[PDB]
Amino acid sequence: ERDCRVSSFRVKENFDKARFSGTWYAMAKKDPEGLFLQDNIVAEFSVDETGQMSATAKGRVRLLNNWDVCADMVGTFTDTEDPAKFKMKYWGVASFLQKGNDDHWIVDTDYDTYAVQYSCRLLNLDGTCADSYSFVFSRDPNGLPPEAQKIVRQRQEELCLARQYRLIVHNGYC
Ligand SMILES: CCCCCCCCCCCCCCCC(=O)O
Ligand SMILES: [Cl-]
Ligand SMILES: [Cl-]
Numbered sequence: 001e002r003d004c005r006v007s008s009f010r011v012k013e014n015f016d017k018a019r020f021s022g023t024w025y026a027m028a029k030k031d032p033e034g035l036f037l038q039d040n041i042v043a044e045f046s047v048d049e050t051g052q053m054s055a056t057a058k059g060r061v062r063l064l065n066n067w068d069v070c071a072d073m074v075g076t077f078t079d080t081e082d083p084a085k086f087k088m089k090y091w092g093v094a095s096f097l098q099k100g101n102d103d104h105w106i107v108d109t110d111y112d113t114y115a116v117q118y119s120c121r122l123l124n125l126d127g128t129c130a131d132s133y134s135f136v137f138s139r140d141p142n143g144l145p146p147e148a149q150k151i152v153r154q155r156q157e158e159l160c161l162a163r164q165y166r167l168i169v170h171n172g173y174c
Contacts, residue, residue: 004160005127006120011084012106017047019111024137026059027144028165032121032133036098037071038062040173043137053077053086058174061097070174071097077104088119108155113139114148116155134161141170 026041041059048054057073072093077086084106091099102119109115115137120129136152138144144152156162 002157002160004129006123006129007127009105009107009118009159011082011118012108013084015084015106015109016111017045017051017053020053020106020109020115021045021047022139024115024139025141025170026135026168027138028136028167030132030134030161030164031166032119033131035133036061037073038068039169040070040171041135041168042141042170042174043135051079053079060173068173073097075104107134107159108151109137110148114144114152116152116159118159128160132159132161134159134165136165 022045024043024045026043029037029041037057037059039060041057043055043057045053045055054077055075057075059071060068061071062068073090074093075088075090077088079086086104087101088104089101091097102121105118107116107118117135117137118132119134120132122129122131124130134156153162156165
């Protein structure tokens with residue numbers, strides 16, 4: 001009976017790009033089809049004077065045949081009418097790395113502790129998402145405090161994803 005229509009999902013009110021800048025460690029991920037970033041995922045968010053948000057990311061990716069590489073990715077965000085919803089153009093510093101353009105929603109954050117991100121790449125005909133991914137980010141690479149963990153779990157459930165996350169390990173591979 002819970003609403004899993006993407007159009008129903010709440011996102012961060014009055015999202016503040018400047019407060020969001022800096023280092024975010026991925027603690028958990030819900031994978032999309034043909035997943036790219038595997039683990040050791042660390043993102044760096046910036047804003048320029050124009051107010052344009054951008055980011056970089058490091059992480060182990062596993063090209064099939066069991067070949068691991070540390071991908072180095074770049075993203076630039078185009079604003080929409082909702083301050084928490086963006087279009088993210090992304091590519092790798094190496095051109096053979098995956099490129100594309102995904103929706104990028106900041107579903108919730110408190111800026112200094114946790115963030116929950118969401119992207120629906122493709123809708124179902126009933127408004128639910130056919131192909132989604134989601135990152136949970138922490139400022140501390142050792143994980144979230146209990147109060148933040150509990151908030152995040154609630155958001156995960158609201159996105160209809162709470163059963164579908166896996167933990168992201170950080171072991172200095174990159
Ligand atoms: C959304 C993650 C951090 C945002 C920074 C964007 C920098 C480019 C990272 C590309 C993410 C594309 C891969 C996401 C889906 C996946 O990993 O399977
Ligand atoms: Cl709990
Ligand atoms: Cl669960």
